[PDB]
Structure 1
Amino acid sequence: LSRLDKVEAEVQIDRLITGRLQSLQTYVTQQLIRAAEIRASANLAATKM
């Protein structure tokens, strides 16, 4: 945004947005899978309690 004006920048921004959004979808997917693992361990802990 210091280098380029909007009509060119929008392509550059779209590339960063794509990769940053795919980074978050990877994070949030993996945190959901790992949250299911914790909830299994939490139910086991509750049963052992």
Structure 2
Amino acid sequence: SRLDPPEAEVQIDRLITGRLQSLQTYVTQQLIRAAEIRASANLAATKMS
């Protein structure tokens, strides 16, 4: 609301790059943690079997 199309565009581009970096770091770190969880889940299924 405070900004007009041109610099609203550039600032929102900086902010969406920042949020994309944050969400991509979240997704990649959660993929790593999901690989850890999947290794633990394969271990759990191995113990179950």
TM-score by length of 2: 0.89
Cα-to-partner distance string for 1:13-49 (whole Å, 9 max, x where unaligned):
1110010000000000000000010111111111111
> What are the ranges of 5 or more consecutive residues in structure 1 without an aligned counterpart?
none
The answer to whether structure 1 residue 3 and structure 2 residue 2 are counterparts is: yes
Work out the percentage of aligned pairs sharing the same amino acid: 96
Number of matched residues? 48
In structure 1, C-alpha distance between the alignment counterparts of 2:5 and 2:15, rounded to whole Å: 15
Deviating 4+ runs (over 4 angstroms):
none
In structure 2, C-alpha distance between the alignment counterparts of 1:29 and 1:21, rounded to whole Å: 12
